[PDB]
Amino acid sequence: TTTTGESADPVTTTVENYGGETQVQRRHHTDVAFVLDRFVKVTVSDNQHTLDVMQAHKDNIVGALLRAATYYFSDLEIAVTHTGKLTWVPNGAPVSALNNTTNPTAYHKGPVTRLALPYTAPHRVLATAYTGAHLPTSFNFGAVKAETITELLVRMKRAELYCPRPILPIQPTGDRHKQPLVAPAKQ
Amino acid sequence: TTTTGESADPVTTTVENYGGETQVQRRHHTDVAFVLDRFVKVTVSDNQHTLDVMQAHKDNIVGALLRAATYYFSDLEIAVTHTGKLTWVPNGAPVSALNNTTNPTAYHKGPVTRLALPYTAPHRVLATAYTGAHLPTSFNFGAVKAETITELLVRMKRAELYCPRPILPIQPTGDRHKQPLVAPAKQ
Amino acid sequence: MFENVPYVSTRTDGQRLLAKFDVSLAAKHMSNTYLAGLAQYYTQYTGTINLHFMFTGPTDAKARYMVAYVPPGMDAPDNPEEAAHCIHAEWDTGLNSKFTFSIPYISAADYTYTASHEAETTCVQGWVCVYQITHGKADADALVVSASAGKDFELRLPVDARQQ
Amino acid sequence: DKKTEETTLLEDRILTTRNGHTTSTTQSSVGVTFGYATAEDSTSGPNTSALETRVHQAERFFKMALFDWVPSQNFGHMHKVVLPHEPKGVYGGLVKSYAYMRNGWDVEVTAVGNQFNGGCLLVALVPEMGDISDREKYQLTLYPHQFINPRTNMTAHITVPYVGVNRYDQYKQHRPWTLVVMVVAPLTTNTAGAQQIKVYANIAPTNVHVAGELPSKE
Amino acid sequence: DKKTEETTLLEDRILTTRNGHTTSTTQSSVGVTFGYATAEDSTSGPNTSALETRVHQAERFFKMALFDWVPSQNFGHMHKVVLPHEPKGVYGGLVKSYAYMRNGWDVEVTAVGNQFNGGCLLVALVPEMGDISDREKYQLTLYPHQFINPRTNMTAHITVPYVGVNRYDQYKQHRPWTLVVMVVAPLTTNTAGAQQIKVYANIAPTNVHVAGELPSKE
Amino acid sequence: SGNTGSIINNYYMQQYQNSMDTQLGNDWFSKLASSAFSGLFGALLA
Amino acid sequence: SGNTGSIINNYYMQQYQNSMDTQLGNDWFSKLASSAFSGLFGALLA
Cβ-based contacts of B9 with chain F (< 8 Å): 35-37
What domains are defined for chain A? 1-187 (2.60.120.20)
Q: How far is residue B157's CA from residue B114's CA, in Å, rounded to a whole number?
A: 14
Cβ-based contacts of B89 with chain C (< 8 Å): 159, 161
Q: How far is residue E74's CA from residue G27's CA, in Å, rounded to a whole number?
A: 64
Cβ-based contacts of E56 with chain D (< 8 Å): 53
Q: How far is residue C86's CA from residue C75's CA, in Å, rounded to a whole number?
A: 12
Cβ-based contacts of F23 with chain B (< 8 Å): none
Longest dimension (CA), chain D: 63
| End-to-end Cα spacing for chain A | 52
Q: How far is residue E45's CA from residue B127's CA, in Å, rounded to a whole number?
A: 51
Helix (H, G, I), strand (E, B) or coil at E174: coil
Q: How far is residue A114's CA from residue A102's CA, in Å, rounded to a whole number?
A: 18
Q: Is G8 in contact with F11 (Cβ distance < 8 A)?
A: yes
Q: Is B134 in contact with A187 (Cβ distance < 8 A)?
A: yes
Contact call for F and G: 3+ CB–CB distances under 8 Å: yes
Q: At how many Å resolution was this determined?
A: 3.5
Phi/psi for B36 (5° steps) reads: -65, -15
Peptide bond into D87 cis (omega under 30): no
Give the gap in angstroms from C-alpha A118 to the nearest C-alpha of chain D.
Answer: 44
D118-D121-D123 Cα angle (round to 5): 160
Cβ-based contacts of A38 with chain G (< 8 Å): 3
Fill in the amino acid letter for C31: S
Which chains would you list as touching F if contact means 3+ CB atom pairs under 8 Å?
A: B, D, G
Helices (H), A41-150: 61-66
Which chains would you list as touching A if contact means 3+ CB atom pairs under 8 Å?
A: B, C, D, E, G
Give the gap in angstroms from C-alpha B99 to the nearest C-alpha of chain A.
Answer: 12
Element (H, E) at D187: strand D177-188
Chain F residues 2-31 within an 8 A CB cutoff of chain B? 2-4, 17-19, 29
Q: How far is residue C13's CA from residue A25's CA, in Å, rounded to a whole number?
A: 42
CB distance C132 to C15 below 8 Å: yes
Mutation for A interface: G1, G32, G40, most A CBs within 10 A: G1
Contact call for D and G: 3+ CB–CB distances under 8 Å: no
Element (H, E) at A4: none
Cβ-based contacts of G41 with chain E (< 8 Å): 3, 14
Which residues lie below 8 Å from residue E114, measured CB to CB, with a gap of 6+? Answer: C60, C61, C62, C136, C137, C138, E150, E192, E193, E194
Kindly identify which residue of chain E lies nearest to residue A4, measuring between CA atoms: E5
Q: Which of E175, E41, E177 is nearest to E107 (CA)?
A: E177
Q: Is B174 on the interface with C (CB under 8 A)?
A: no
| End-to-end Cα spacing for chain C | 27
Cβ-based contacts of G7 with chain F (< 8 Å): 9-13
**Residue A127 burial by CB count (10 A; 0-12/13-18/19+): exposed, middle or buried?**
middle
Element (H, E) at C101: strand C98-103
CB distance D140 to D122 below 8 Å: yes
Peptide bond into E71 cis (omega under 30): no
What domains are defined for chain E? 1-218 (2.60.120.20)
Q: How far is residue B12's CA from residue B18's CA, in Å, rounded to a whole number?
A: 14
Element (H, E) at A102: none
Q: How far is residue G35's CA from residue D183's CA, in Å, rounded to a whole number?
A: 68
Which residues lie below 8 Å from residue A180, measured CB to CB, with a gap of 6+? Answer: B94, B95, B96, C117, C118
Q: How far is residue D213's CA from residue D190's CA, in Å, rounded to a whole number?
A: 56
Look at chain G and report how many structural domains it folds into: 1
Q: Is C136 in contact with E197 (Cβ distance < 8 A)?
A: yes
Q: How far is residue D205's CA from residue C41's CA, in Å, rounded to a whole number?
A: 42
CB atoms within 10 A of CB A135: 14
Longest dimension (CA), chain C: 52
The conformation of residue E115, written as its DSSP 8-state character, comes to T
Kindly give the pairing relationship between strand E155-160 and strand E33-34.
parallel
CB atoms within 10 A of CB E57: 22
- List the CATH number of the domain containing C39: 2.60.120.20
CB atoms within 10 A of CB B142: 27
Q: Is E62 in contact with C81 (Cβ distance < 8 A)?
A: yes
Fill in the amino acid letter for A91: N
Cβ contacts from A onto D, under 8 A: 17
- List the CATH number of the domain containing G17: 4.10.90.10
Give the gap in angstroms from C-alpha D139 to the nearest C-alpha of chain B.
Answer: 6
Q: Is B101 in contact with A41 (Cβ distance < 8 A)?
A: yes
Cα dihedral sign, E66-E72-E73-E74: positive
The alpha carbons of chain F give a radius of gyration, in whole angstroms, of: 22
Owning domain of residue C140 = 1-164
Chain A residues 14-43 within an 8 A CB cutoff of chain D? 15, 18-24
CB distance A101 to A95 below 8 Å: no
Q: Is E15 in contact with G43 (Cβ distance < 8 A)?
A: yes
CB distance D209 to D102 below 8 Å: yes
Which chains would you list as touching E if contact means 3+ CB atom pairs under 8 Å?
A: A, C, D, G
Measured CA distances, B82 to B43, B93, B148, D202, E34 (Å): 14, 22, 5, 58, 77
Kindly identify which residue of chain C lies nearest to residue E2, measuring between CA atoms: C95
Owning domain of residue G16 = 1-46
Contact call for D and F: 3+ CB–CB distances under 8 Å: yes
Cα dihedral sign, D27-D32-D38-D40: negative
Q: Is F19 in contact with B119 (Cβ distance < 8 A)?
A: yes
Taking the mean position of all CA atoms in its chain, how far away is CA A109? 26
Q: Is D103 on the interface with B (CB under 8 A)?
A: no
CB atoms within 10 A of CB D68: 15
Cβ-based contacts of D42 with chain F (< 8 Å): 24-25
